[PDB]
Design a protein around this motif. Structure first.
Motif, short mmCIF file in Angstrom:
data_model
loop_
_atom_site.label_atom_id
_atom_site.label_comp_id
_atom_site.label_asym_id
_atom_site.label_seq_id
_atom_site.Cartn_x
_atom_site.Cartn_y
_atom_site.Cartn_z
N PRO A 45 -4.72 -26.00 -0.69
CA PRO A 45 -4.79 -27.39 -1.18
C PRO A 45 -3.48 -28.14 -1.00
CG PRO A 45 -5.94 -25.98 -2.70
CD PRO A 45 -5.44 -25.08 -1.60
N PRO A 46 -2.31 -27.53 -1.29
CA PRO A 46 -1.06 -28.17 -0.86
C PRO A 46 -0.65 -27.68 0.52
CG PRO A 46 -0.54 -26.42 -2.39
CD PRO A 46 -2.02 -26.32 -2.10
N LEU A 47 0.49 -28.14 1.04
CA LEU A 47 0.93 -27.74 2.38
C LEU A 47 1.40 -26.29 2.34
CD1 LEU A 47 2.77 -30.99 3.50
CD2 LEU A 47 0.53 -30.16 4.23
N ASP A 48 0.43 -25.38 2.31
CA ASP A 48 0.66 -23.94 2.36
C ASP A 48 0.10 -23.45 3.69
OD1 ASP A 48 1.91 -23.84 -0.13
OD2 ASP A 48 0.01 -23.50 -1.18
N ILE A 49 0.94 -23.49 4.72
CA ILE A 49 0.52 -23.17 6.08
C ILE A 49 0.68 -21.68 6.32
CG2 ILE A 49 0.97 -23.57 8.52
CD1 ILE A 49 2.01 -26.36 7.70
N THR A 50 -0.36 -21.05 6.87
CA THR A 50 -0.33 -19.63 7.21
C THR A 50 -0.93 -19.46 8.60
OG1 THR A 50 -0.62 -19.08 4.87
CG2 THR A 50 -0.97 -17.32 6.48
N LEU A 51 -0.15 -18.90 9.52
CA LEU A 51 -0.65 -18.62 10.86
C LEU A 51 -1.70 -17.52 10.79
CD1 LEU A 51 -0.48 -18.87 14.00
CD2 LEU A 51 1.24 -17.06 13.88
N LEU A 52 -2.85 -17.74 11.43
CA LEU A 52 -3.98 -16.83 11.32
C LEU A 52 -4.31 -16.13 12.63
CD1 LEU A 52 -6.60 -18.78 9.17
CD2 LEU A 52 -5.03 -17.01 8.39
N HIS A 53 -4.65 -16.87 13.68
CA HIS A 53 -5.32 -16.22 14.80
C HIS A 53 -4.34 -15.44 15.68
CE1 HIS A 53 -7.94 -15.20 18.00
NE2 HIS A 53 -7.54 -16.15 18.83
N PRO A 54 -3.31 -16.06 16.28
CA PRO A 54 -2.35 -15.19 16.99
C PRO A 54 -1.37 -14.58 16.00
CG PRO A 54 -2.38 -17.50 17.80
CD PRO A 54 -2.94 -17.48 16.43
#
Ligand code: CLA
Ligand code: CLA
Ligand code: CLA
Ligand code: CLA
Ligand code: CLA
Ligand code: CLA
Ligand code: CLA
Ligand SMILES: CCCCCCCC(=O)OCC(=C\C=C\C(C)=C\C=C\C=C(C)\C=C\C=C(/C)C=C=C1C(C)(C)C[C@H](OC(C)=O)C[C@@]1(C)O)/C=C/[C@@]12O[C@]1(C)C[C@@H](O)CC2(C)C
Ligand SMILES: CC(/C=C/C=C(C)/C=C/[C@@]12O[C@]1(C)C[C@@H](O)CC2(C)C)=C\C=C\C=C(C)\C=C\C=C(C)\C=C\[C@@]12O[C@]1(C)C[C@@H](O)CC2(C)C
Ligand SMILES: CC(/C=C/C=C(C)/C=C/[C@@]12O[C@]1(C)C[C@@H](O)CC2(C)C)=C\C=C\C=C(C)\C=C\C=C(C)\C=C\[C@@]12O[C@]1(C)C[C@@H](O)CC2(C)C
Ligand SMILES: CC1=C(C/C=C(\C)CCC[C@H](C)CCC[C@H](C)CCCC(C)C)C(=O)c2ccccc2C1=O
Lengths: 80, 162, 30, 73, 171, 130, 34, 223, 153, 147, 72
Positions: F86-95
Motif C-alpha cells: 500500500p505504501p511505496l514498498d517496492i520488492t523485486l519479484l521476477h528476476p
C-alpha cells in the motif's frame, strides 16, 4: 497458500519452470540427474494452483506435485 | 462577433446592430447561454407542436390537437410537475456553471475532453446553433399564426390558409 | 381439548429445555 | 436420450478413466486388451457429447409432441 | 476530438473518463445529492436519505399491497405506512450491523496523517490502512448516519402518507 | 495526456486494477524497448510501447508475467516485475537473482525437495491428529 | 386470551422476529475479527 | 394455412435452425478473436475499444438479464402463488392487475389502417394477424387477428429475457476469449480447452467454447 | 443496565395496566371483532359452524398502542448517540454496580429511587401473574380485587 | 473475516466468501479441526449424540403436542375409517378466503396427517388428547435429561 | 449448478465486482469478504442438494396428491 513439492525423479528438463504463470518454480543446481539441475518451489506464496507445472512434467508419475491448501487473494487469482 | 462558434456562411459574425462590439466576455457568455437555451427550448417546442398536432396518445385522447388550446387543458397538476422538473434541471445547470473551466452553453462538460477543438466539433456546435435559431423563428411563427388564424400548423397548411 | 394451564406449563417446561440446549450448545464451544 | 445426456453433463473424466482401468484389467486378464489404449472422452468432448445429446433429446421430444398433437387435431 | 480518455491520466485503472462518469452534469448532480453534498453532517445526510427513501417507499406498499383499494381507504394507507416503516427498520438494522463490522474509527482524516507521520508499527487496519477519509467512514459517523436514516425514514413515510391522503380526498 | 512519460501509449481499459491495488498490493513491470511496438495488454486491448523506458502497473503478478511472456516475442528480455505494498514498498519479484528461473544460477538452494519418489509418501492414517 | 390466539401470537413472532435476530447474530459473528 | 401440421412444423424447424445458426455465429466470432485477431492491426478501432470496456458491457448485460428474469418469471411465479393461495384478484391477469402491451397494439392498429391511409394503393392489410376479418378455407381458419393481452406481455418479456441471457453468455465468451482477470493469457490456451486448472478457486469452462456450450443450452431454452 | 431498563418498563406497564382497566370499565375499548374482509384471513381466529370468529377489535387497538410504545423504544435503541441513557453498554463501559439486597435509601429523582421502584414494580408484576395463575381469574380481575373495586367500577 | 471457522485457521484467513461457505460444510468434520486430539474427538461426538437424541425426542414431543392440541384424535377414535387425521393447524397470513375455506377442517385450517401417528398411538393404547399431552410432557423431560 | 461449472461464474462475478466498485451512491458500501464463485466441490454439492430436494419434494407431492385425489 498451496503446497508444491519436488521429488528426486526430477530430470531437470525445466518444462515446469517455464510453464508456471506466477513465477513459483525455479531451476537450482543438483547432482542427482544428468542435467545437474532440479526444480525448486521457493515462492509458493504466489502459487495459484493452476497445475500447469505438472501438466508439463515428463517423468512417470510427476516430479512436481501441487497440494491445494489454504486460500489467499494471491492463490485465488483475485484482481479485486 | 468574435472567434466564437456559430459563424456560418450566409452572414459571418452576424451582429448588424453591434450588440457584441461593446460587450465584455461575461456579457457575451451570457448572450451565448441565452441563445443556446432559447434554441434548445425552441427545437423542443417545434417538435412538440407538430407531433401533438398529429399525435396526442396521452390523456386518453382528448387534449385538443391544436396547441395553445391544450395549454389550458392539461390537469394543471401535470403543469406543476413539468415546471418543477425544469426548475430542478436549471438548478443543476446553475451548479454546473460554477465548475472550473465552464463554457457558456456547455452543460455536458465537453471542455474536460475537448482541448484544442477540431473543425468537426466547431461545425457540430454551429449546426446545433443554426438549428436552434431556425427553430426559434419557426416557433415564433407557429405561435403567431395560431394566435391570428386559430388553426394549427398542419391544419392551416392542409386547408390552404397561406 | 387441553386447557390454558396445560399448554402454558408445557411452554414453560419447553423454555427450561431451551436453556439446557444453549448450555450444551455453548459447552460444545463457539 | 435427454436423460442419457445428463450422465456426460453431470459426471467427470476421472471416474470414467478409473472405471476403464478395471475394465482394461479384465481384458488383460483375458488377453483381449486392444492395442489402441481405451481412454475416457476428453473433458471438452464429454461436454460436447452431453450438449449434443441434451439438444437431440429435448428437440426430439418437442418434435414428437408437436407432430402427434397437431396431426391428431 | 475524443470523448473517452483514461481516468485521471492513469491508463491502468479499471475505469474510464466517459461523458457519463466525468461529465459536468454528473459532477454537479452527484455533488447536490445528500451522500456527497458539501456542508452536511452525517446525521443530516442520513436524515435526508431516510426522508426521501421512506417517501418513495410508502408508494409501492400502499398501491400494490395485500390490502389495496381502488378508492381511498384508511386501512390501506395504514398498511402501506406500517410496511414502509418496518422496511425502514430492516434497512436501519442492516446499516447498523454493517457499520459495526466495517469501521473502527471515531475521527477520520487525521489518523491517516498520524500514521503517515508518527509511524504505525501496530496491528494495523486501524492505525494504518483506513479506506476513505469521509466522516461517514467512522464508527461514530456511520452510527449517526443510521440514526438519521431511521428518523428521516419515519418522518418521510408519515409525510408521504399525509400527502397521499390529501391527494385522494381533496382531488 | 498520461501521468508519466514512460507509460505505454494505452488509452485505458475498464479491466485494470481496482480498489484492491490501492490498499493491499500492486505490481509494476518495467522494461526498455528499442521500438514503439504495438502490444496487447493483459487486461484490455492494444497499447503502444515507448522507444525507451516503459512502465506498467497491474493488479496481479500473473498479469505482469503474462505481459513479460508476451514481451519475449518482441525480443525483449530485460523486463523486471516488482511488488508494491500500500505504501511505496517496492520488492523485486521476477528476476529474483537477475537470472530467469528457467536458467540455473549458483546461489539457489532447493526448496520443497523430497529425497524420494511419490511412492515414498507416508500413509495418511499415520498422519492423524498432528 | 384463548388458546386459538396462540397461532397468531407465535407464527409471526417465530417466523419473522427469530430470522431477524438470528441473522443479526450470525452476521455479527461471521464478520468478527481477532 | 389450413394445414396446421405444416405451419407448426415449418415455424418450429426454421426457428430451431435460426437459433443454432446464431449460436454458431457467436462461436465463430469467439474463434476469430482467439485465432485470427491481431492486436497490432486493430489499434484503437471498434474491436479494440469494445475489448477495452468489456467489463461495462458484460456487467450491464448481467443487470439487464437479472432485471428481465426477475420480472418476467417472478410475475409468472406471483401469478402461480396467488392462484394457489385463492387470491384470484391479485394476479397479473386481464381481470386483475393488467399489463396491456399498448405499444404492440398501437402497431397492430397502424397496420390494419395502412391500406388507404399510409399504403393507399393497398386493398388489404399485409397480414390479418394485425387485424381485419377471419379468413377461412373449407371451414378451417387460415388467418385471424391475433389479440395481444397480458398473457402475451409476459411471454414476450420471457422471450426478451431468454434472448438477453443467451446474448450474455455468447458475448462474454467472445469478449473474454483472449484474456481476463483470471487468466491473463487465455488466448495462448486456444479456443477449445477444458480449463486452466483447479487453482484460482477453480477455472472450469473458462474457454470460449465452454461458452458456446452454455449458450447452446440457453438457446435451447429460449427456442 | 438490564435490571434498570426492565424496572422502568415494569413501572410504565403498571401504569398501562391501570389505564387498560380504566378504559375497559369506562366504556372505551371498542366492541366487536376485526373485519376479515378488510384485514385478510390472518385475523380469523376460528370457524365454529359457519361463522368466523376474528381477533377482537379491542385487542387490535391495544396492540396498536403497544406498537406505538415499542416503536418509541426501537427508535431510542437505534438512536444511541442522542439519548441520555443508552440501551446497551458501549465497549469499555462497565456495568453500573449492583445495588445489592437493599439499594441506598435516597429519596427523590435519584438512581437508587428509580432502581428500588423498578424492582418493586417487577416484583409486583410477578406477584400479579402468580396470583392470577394460582387462583384463576383475569389479570384485570386480580388488579380490581387488589384495588378494592376502584378500578373496574 | 475472522473467528467464524474457529476450528480451522486456514479457512479463517480466507479473504473471500469461500470461508463462510466452507465454515458451514466442515463444522462436523471434527477430525480435520485445528488443535485436535482423539480424546476431544470422542467426547465431542458423545455430546453431539446426546444433543441429537434430545432433538429427536423434542420432535416427537412436538408431534404429540400438536396432535393433542390441534388434531382430531378423539373424534378419529370413534370413526377411524371415515374421519381423516389432522396433523396441525395452519396460520398463514398469505391465505385468501378461498384457501382458508378449502383448508378449513373443523375449527381452523389444518393439514391432514400422513405420518400414520394416529393409528400408531391408537394401537399402543391412547384414547384421549390428555394421553398425548402426557407423552409430550414426558418427552420434553427426557430431552432435558439428555441435554 | 451441475451443468455449468466454475470459471464461467468467476469472470461474471468479477464483472459484477467492477460494476459495484465503479458506481456512485453504492461505493459507500463495500464487502468485507471478497465475492468469489463457489468452489468446484461446493458447486457439485449444491447442485446435488438442489437435485435431491427437488426430486424428493416433487415425488412426495405427486404420490400424496395422486392418492388423495384418486382414492377419494
Ligand atoms: C417545450 C417542450 C414541450 C412542451 C412544453 C410540451 C407540452 C405538452 N405536450 Mg409535448 N412534446 C414535445 C415537447 C413539448 N411538449 C416534444 C419534443 C415531443 C416529441 C416527442 C412531444 C410529444 C408530445 C405528445 C405525443 C403528447 C404531448 C402532449 C403535451 C401536453 C401535455 C403534456 C404531456 O403529456 O407532455 C408529453 C411529452 C412527451 C411525451 C415528450 C416530452 C419529451 C421532452 C420534451 C424531452 C425531454 C425533456 C427533459 C426532461 C428536459 C431536457 C433535458 C436537458 C436538455 C436539459 C403539453 C401541452 C400530450 C398532449 O395532450 O398533446 C396535445 C401528448 O399526448 N407532447
Ligand atoms: C418520480 C416519479 C413520478 C411519479 C410517481 C409521478 C406521479 C404522477 N404523475 Mg408525473 N412526472 C414525473 C415523475 C413522476 N410523476 C416527471 C419526472 C415528469 C416530467 C416533468 C412528470 C410529468 C407528468 C405530467 C405532465 C403529468 C403527470 C401526472 C402524474 C399523476 C398521474 C400518473 C398516473 O398514471 O396516474 C396515477 C401521478 C400523481 C399527470 C397528472 O398529475 O394529472 C392528473 C400529468 O398530467 N406527471
Ligand atoms: C420440534 C418440534 C416442533 C415443531 C417442528 C413444531 C412446529 C410448529 N409449531 Mg410447535 N410446539 C412444540 C414442538 C414443535 N412445534 C412443543 C414441544 C410445544 C410445546 C411448548 C409447541 C407449542 C407450540 C405453540 C403454542 C404454537 C406452535 C406452533 C407451531 C407452528 C409454527 C411455528 C411456531 O410458532 O413455533 C412456536 C413454537 C413454540 C413456541 C414452542 C417451541 C418449539 C420446540 C419446543 C422447540 C424445538 C426446537 C427444535 C428441536 C430445533 C430448533 C432449531 C433452532 C435452533 C433454529 C409449527 C407447525 C404455532 C401454531 O400452531 O401455529 C399454527 C403455535 O401457536 N407450537
Ligand atoms: C413465517 C413467515 C412469514 C410470516 C408470518 C409473514 C407474514 C406476512 N407477510 Mg410475508 N413473506 C415471507 C415470510 C413470512 N411473511 C417470506 C419468506 C417471503 C418471501 C417469499 C414473504 C413475502 C411476502 C410478500 C411479498 C408480502 C408478504 C406479506 C405479508 C403479510 C400478510 C399480508 C397481510 O394481510 O398483512 C398486511 C400487512 C400489514 C397491514 C402491515 C404489516 C407490516 C409489518 C409486517 C408489521 C410488523 C410490525 C412490527 C412489529 C413493527 C416493528 C416496530 C416498528 C414500527 C419500528 C404478513 C405480515 C404482504 C404484506 O403485507 O406486505 C408488507 C406482502 O405483500 N410477505
Ligand atoms: C429453473 C432453473 C434455472 C433458473 C431459475 C435459472 C436462473 C438463472 N440463470 Mg440459469 N441455467 C440453468 C437453469 C436455470 N437458471 C441451467 C440448467 C443451466 C445450464 C446450462 C443454466 C446456465 C446459466 C448460465 C450460463 C447463465 C444463467 C443465468 C441465469 C440468471 C439470469 C438472470 C435472472 O433472471 O436472475 C433472476 C433470477 C431468477 C429469475 C430466478 C427466480 C427468482 C425469483 C422469481 C424472484 C426472486 C425471488 C425472491 C428473491 C425469493 C426470496 C425469498 C427466499 C429468500 C426464501 C438466473 C439466476 C445467467 C446469469 O448469471 O445471470 C445473468 C448466465 O450467464 N444460467
Ligand atoms: C419480480 C417479480 C415480482 C413482482 C414485480 C411482484 C410484484 C408484487 N407482488 Mg409478488 N411475488 C413474487 C414475484 C414478484 N411479485 C414471487 C416470486 C413470489 C413468491 C415468493 C411472490 C409472492 C407474493 C406475495 C405472497 C404477495 C406478493 C405481492 C405483490 C405486490 C406487492 C408487493 C410489494 O409490496 O411491493 C413492494 C415494492 C417495493 C418496496 C418497491 C420495489 C420496486 C421499485 C419501484 C423499484 C424502483 C426502481 C427504480 C425505477 C430505479 C430508478 C430510480 C431512479 C431515481 C433512477 C406486487 C404487485 C402482495 C400482494 O398481494 O399484491 C397483490 C403479496 O401479498 N407477492
Ligand atoms: C413491545 C413492548 C414495549 C413497550 C410497551 C415499551 C414501552 C416503553 N419503552 Mg421500550 N423497548 C422495547 C419494547 C417495549 N417498550 C424493546 C423490545 C426494546 C429494545 C429495542 C426497547 C427499548 C427502549 C429504549 C431504549 C427506550 C424505551 C422507552 C420506552 C418508554 C416510552 C414510552 C414513553 O414515551 O413514555 C412517555 C415505554 C416505557 C424509552 C424510555 O425509557 O421511556 C421514555 C427509551 O429510552 N424502550
Ligand atoms: C396501550 C394503551 C391502552 C389504552 C386502551 C385503548 C387505547 C388504545 O387503543 O391505544 C392505541 C391507540 C393509540 C395509541 C397511541 C399511543 C400509544 C401513542 C404513544 C406515543 C408515544 C410517544 C409519542 C412517545 C414519545 C417518547 C419519547 C420521545 C421518549 C423519550 C425520551 C425522553 C422523553 C426521555 C427524552 C430523551 O431525550 C434525549 C436525550 O434524547 C429521549 C428519550 C427517548 O429518552 C389508538 C387506538 C384506536 O385508534 C385505533 C387503533 C382504532 C380506533 O377505532 C379505536 C382506538 C381509538 C382505540
Ligand atoms: C423482568 C420482569 C418483568 C418485566 C415486566 C415488564 C418489562 C413490563 C411489561 C409491561 O409494560 C409492558 C411492556 C406492557 C403492559 O401492557 C404490560 C406490562 C407487562 C405491564 C420480571 C422479572 C422477574 C425476575 C425474577 C423474579 C427473577 C428471579 C430470579 C431468581 C430467584 C434467581 C435465583 C438465582 O440467581 C440466584 C439467586 C443464584 C443463582 O446461582 C441460582 C439462581 C436460582 C438462578
Ligand atoms: C412502582 C410501580 C409503578 C410506578 C409507576 C411509575 C413510576 C409511573 C410513572 C409515570 O411516568 C409514567 C411512567 C407515565 C406518566 O403518564 C404517569 C407517571 C405516573 C408520571 C408499581 C409497583 C407495584 C408494586 C406492587 C404491585 C407490589 C406488590 C408486592 C407484593 C404483592 C408483595 C408481596 C410480599 O410482601 C409480601 C405480601 C410478603 C413478603 O414476605 C413476600 C412478598 C411476596 C414480597
Ligand atoms: C460415460 C462417460 C465416458 C465414457 C464414454 C465412452 C468411453 C464413449 C464410448 C463410445 C463407444 C465406444 C462408441 C459409441 C457406441 C454407440 C453405440 C454408438 C452411438 C449410437 C449411434 C446410433 C450414433 C467419458 O469418457 C466421459 C468423459 C467426460 C464426462 C463424462 C463422461 C461419461 O459420462
Amino acid at each position: 497458500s498451496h503446497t508444491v513439492k519436488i521429488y528426486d525423479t526430477c530430470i531437470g528438463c525445466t518444462q515446469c519452470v517455464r510453464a508456471c504463470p506466477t513465477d513459483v518454480l525455479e531451476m537450482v543446481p543438483w547432482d542427482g540427474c544428468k542435467a545437474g539441475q532440479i526444480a525448486s518451489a521457493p515462492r509458493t506464496e504466489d502459487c495459484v494452483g493452476c497445475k500447469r507445472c505438472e501438466t508439463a512434467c515428463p517423468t512417470d508419475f510427476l516430479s512436481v506435485r501441487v497440494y491445494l491448501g489454504g486460500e489467499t487473494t494471491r492463490s485465488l487469482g483475485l484482481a479485486y | 462577433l468574435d472567434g466564437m462558434i456559430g459563424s456560418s456562411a450566409p452572414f459571418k459574425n452576424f451582429d448588424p446592430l453591434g450588440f457584441a462590439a461593446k460587450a465584455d466576455q461575461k456579457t457575451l457568455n451570457k448572450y451565448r447561454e441565452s441563445e443556446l437555451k432559447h434554441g434548445r427550448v425552441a427545437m423542443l417546442a417545434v417538435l412538440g407542436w407538430i407531433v401533438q398536432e398529429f399525435w396526442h396518445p396521452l390523456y386518453d385522447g382528448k387534449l385538443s390537437s391544436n396547441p395553445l388550446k391544450a395549454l389550458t387543458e392539461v390537469p394543471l397538476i401535470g403543469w406543476a410537475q413539468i415546471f418543477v422538473a425544469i426548475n430542478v434541471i436549471e438548478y443543476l445547470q446553475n451548479k454546473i456553471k460554477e465548475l472550473p473551466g465552464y463554457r457558456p452553453g456547455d452543460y455536458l462538460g465537453t471542455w474536460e475532453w475537448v482541448e484544442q477543438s477540431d473543425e468537426g466539433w466547431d461545425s457540430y456546435q454551429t449546426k446545433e446553433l443554426n438549428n436552434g435559431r431556425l427553430a426559434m423563428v419557426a416557433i415564433a411563427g407557429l405561435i403567431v399564426q395560431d394566435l391570428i388564424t386559430g388553426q394549427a400548423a398542419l391544419e392551416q397548411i392542409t386547408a390552404g390558409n397561406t | 381439548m387441553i386447557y390454558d394451564s396445560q399448554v402454558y406449563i408445557a411452554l414453560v417446561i419447553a423454555v427450561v429445555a431451551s436453556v439446557l440446549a444453549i448450555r450444551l450448545g455453548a459447552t460444545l464451544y463457539n | 436420450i435427454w436423460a442419457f445426456s445428463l450422465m456426460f453433463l453431470f459426471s467427470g473424466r476421472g471416474y470414467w478413466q478409473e472405471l476403464i482401468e478395471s475394465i482394461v484389467w479384465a481384458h488383460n486378464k483375458l488377453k483381449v486388451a486392444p492395442s489402441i489404449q481405451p481412454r475416457a472422452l476428453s473433458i471438452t468432448q464429454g461436454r460436447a457429447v452431453g450438449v449434443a445429446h441434451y439438444l437431440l433429446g429435448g428437440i426430439g421430444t418437442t418434435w414428437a409432441f408437436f407432430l402427434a398433437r397437431i396431426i391428431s387435431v | 476530438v475524443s470523448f473517452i480518455k483514461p481516468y485521471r491520466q492513469d491508463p491502468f485503472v479499471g475505469h474510464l473518463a466517459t461523458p457519463i462518469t466525468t461529465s459536468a452534469f454528473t459532477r454537479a448532480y452527484l455533488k447536490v445529492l445528500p451522500a456527497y453534498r458539501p456542508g452536511l453532517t452525517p446525521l443530516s445526510r442520513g436524515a435526508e436519505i431516510g426522508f426521501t427513501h421512506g417517501y418513495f417507499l410508502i408508494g409501492p406498499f400502499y398501491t400494490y399491497g395485500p390490502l389495496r383499494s381502488v378508492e381511498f381507504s384508511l386501512t390501506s394507507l395504514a398498511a402501506g405506512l406500517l410496511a414502509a416503516i418496518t422496511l425502514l427498520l430492516i434497512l436501519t438494522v442492516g446499516l447498523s450491523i454493517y457499520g459495526q463490522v466495517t469501521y473502527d474509527v471515531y475521527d477520520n482524516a487525521l489518523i491517516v496523517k498520524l500514521v503517515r507521520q508518527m509511524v504505525g508499527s501496530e496491528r494495523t487496519q486501524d492505525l494504518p490502512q483506513i479506506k476513505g477519509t469521509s466522516e461517514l467512514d467512522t464508527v461514530l459517523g456511520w452510527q449517526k448516519f443510521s440514526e438519521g436514516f431511521f428518523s428521516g425514514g419515519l418522518i418521510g413515510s408519515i409525510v408521504a402518507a399525509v400527502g397521499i391522503a390529501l391527494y385522494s380526498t381533496y382531488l | 495526456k498520461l501521468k508519466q512519460s514512460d507509460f505505454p501509449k494505452f488509452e485505458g481499459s475498464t479491466g485494470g486494477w481496482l480498489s484492491a491495488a490501492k490498499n493491499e498490493e500492486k505490481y509494476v513491470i518495467i522494461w526498455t524497448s528499442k521500438d514503439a511496438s504495438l502490444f496487447e495488454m493483459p487486461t484490455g486491448g492494444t497499447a503502444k510501447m515507448n522507444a525507451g523506458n516503459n512502465v506498467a502497473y497491474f493488479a496481479r503478478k500473473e498479469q505482469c508475467l503474462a505481459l513479460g511472456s508476451q514481451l519475449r516475442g518482441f525480443k525483449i528480455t530485460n523486463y523486471k516485475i516488482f511488488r508494491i505494498y500500500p505504501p511505496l514498498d517496492i520488492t523485486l519479484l521476477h528476476p529474483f537473482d537477475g537470472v530467469f528461473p528457467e536458467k540455473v544460477n549458483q546461489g539457489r538452494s532447493p526448496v520443497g525437495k523430497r529425497d524420494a519418489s511419490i511412492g515414498g509418501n507416508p500413509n495418511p492414517a499415520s498422519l492423524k491428529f498432528q | 386470551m384463548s388458546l386459538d390466539l396462540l397461532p397468531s401470537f407465535f407464527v409471526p413472532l417465530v417466523g419473522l422476529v427469530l430470522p431477524l435476530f438470528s441473522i443479526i447474530g450470525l452476521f455479527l459473528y461471521i464478520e468478527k475479527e481477532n | 394455412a389450413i394445414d396446421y401440421p405444416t405451419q407448426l412444423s415449418l415455424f418450429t424447424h426454421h426457428v430451431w435452425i435460426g437459433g443454432f445458426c446464431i449460436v454458431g455465429g457467436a462461436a465463430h466470432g469467439a474463434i476469430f478473436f482467439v485465432r485470427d485477431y491481431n492486436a497490432a492491426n486493430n489499434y484503437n478501432n471498434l474491436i479494440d475499444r469494445v475489448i477495452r470496456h468489456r467489463d461495462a458491457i458484460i456487467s450491464h448485460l448481467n443487470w439487464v438479464c437479472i432485471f428481465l428474469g426477475c420480472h418476467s418469471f417472478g410475475l409468472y411465479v406471483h401469478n402461480d402463488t396467488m392462484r394457489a393461495l385463492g387470491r384470484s384478484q391479485d394476479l397479473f391477469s386481464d381481470n386483475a392487475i393488467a399489463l396491456k402491451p399498448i405499444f404492440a397494439q398501437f402497431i397492430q392498429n397502424l397496420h390494419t389502417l395502412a391500406p388507404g391511409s399510409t399504403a393507399p394503393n393497398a386493398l388489404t392489410t399485409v397480414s390479418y394477424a394485425f387485424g381485419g376479418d377471419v379468413i377461412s378455407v373449407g371451414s378451417k381458419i387460415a388467418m385471424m387477428p391475433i389479440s395481444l393481452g397480458t398473457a402475451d406481455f409476459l411471454v414476450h418479456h420471457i422471450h426478451a429475457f431468454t434472448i438477453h441471457v443467451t446474448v450474455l453468455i455468447l458475448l462474454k465468451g467472445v469478449l473474454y476469449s483472449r484474456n481476463s482477470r483470471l487468466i491473463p493469457d487465455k488466448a495462448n490456451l486456444g479456443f477449445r480447452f477444458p480449463c486452466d486448472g483447479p487453482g484460482r478457486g477453480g477455472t472450469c469452462q473458462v474457454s470460449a467454447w465452454d461458452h458456446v456450450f452454455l449458450g447452446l443450452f440457453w438457446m435451447y431454452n429460449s427456442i | 443496565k438490564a435490571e434498570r431498563w426492565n424496572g422502568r418498563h415494569a413501572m410504565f406497564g403498571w401504569i398501562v395496566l391501570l389505564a387498560t382497566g380504566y378504559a375497559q370499565a369506562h366504556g372505551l375499548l371498542p366492541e366487536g371483532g376485526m373485519d376479515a374482509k378488510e384485514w385478510g384471513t390472518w385475523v380469523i381466529v376460528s370457524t365454529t359452524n359457519g361463522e368466523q370468529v376474528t381477533i377482537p377489535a379491542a385487542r387490535a387497538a391495544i396492540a396498536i398502542g403497544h406498537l406505538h410504545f415499542g416503536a418509541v423504544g426501537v427508535f431510542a435503541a437505534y438512536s444511541k448517540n442522542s439519548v441520555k441513557d443508552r440501551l446497551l453498554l458501549e465497549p469499555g463501559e462497565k456495568d453500573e454496580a449492583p445495588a445489592g439486597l437493599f439499594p441506598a435509601l435516597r429519596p427523590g429523582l435519584t438512581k437508587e429511587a428509580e432502581m428500588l421502584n423498578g424492582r418493586v414494580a417487577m416484583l409486583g408484576l410477578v406477584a400479579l401473574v402468580a396470583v392470577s395463575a394460582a387462583t384463576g381469574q383475569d389479570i384485570l380481575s386480580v388488579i380490581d380485587q387488589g384495588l378494592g373495586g376502584l378500578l373496574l367500577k | 473475516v475472522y473467528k467464524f471457522p474457529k476450528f480451522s485457521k486456514a479457512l479463517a484467513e480466507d479473504p473471500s466468501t469461500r470461508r463462510i461457505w466452507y465454515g458451514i460444510a466442515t463444522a462436523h468434520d471434527f477430525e480435520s479441526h485445528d488443535a485436535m486430539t482423539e480424546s476431544k474427538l470422542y467426547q465431542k461426538i458423545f455430546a453431539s449424540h446426546f444433543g441429537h437424541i434430545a432433538i429427536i425426542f423434542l420432535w416427537t414431543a412436538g408431534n404429540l403436542f400438536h396432535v393433542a392440541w390441534q388434531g382430531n384424535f378423539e373424534a378419529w377414535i370413534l370413526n377411524p375409517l371415515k374421519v381423516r387425521p389432522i396433523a396441525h393447524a395452519i396460520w398463514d397470513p398469505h391465505f385468501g378466503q378461498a384457501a382458508y375455506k378449502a383448508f378449513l377442517k373443523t375449527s381452523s385450517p389444518a393439514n391432514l396427517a400422513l405420518s400414520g401417528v394416529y393409528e400408531w398411538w391408537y394401537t399402543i393404547g391412547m384414547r384421549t388428547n390428555n394421553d398425548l399431552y402426557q407423552g409430550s410432557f414426558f418427552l420434553i423431560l427426557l430431552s432435558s435429561l439428555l441435554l | 449448478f451441475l451443468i455449468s461449472w466454475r470459471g464461467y461464474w468467476q469472470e461474471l462475478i468479477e464483472t459484477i465486482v467492477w460494476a459495484h466498485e465503479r458506481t456512485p451512491l453504492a461505493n459507500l458500501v463495500r464487502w468485507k469478504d471478497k465475492p468469489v464463485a463457489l468452489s468446484i466441490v461446493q458447486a457439485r454439492l449444491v447442485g446435488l442438494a438442489h437435485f435431491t430436494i427437488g426430486y424428493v419434494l416433487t415425488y412426495a407431492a405427486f404420490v400424496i396428491a395422486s392418492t388423495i385425489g384418486k382414492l377419494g
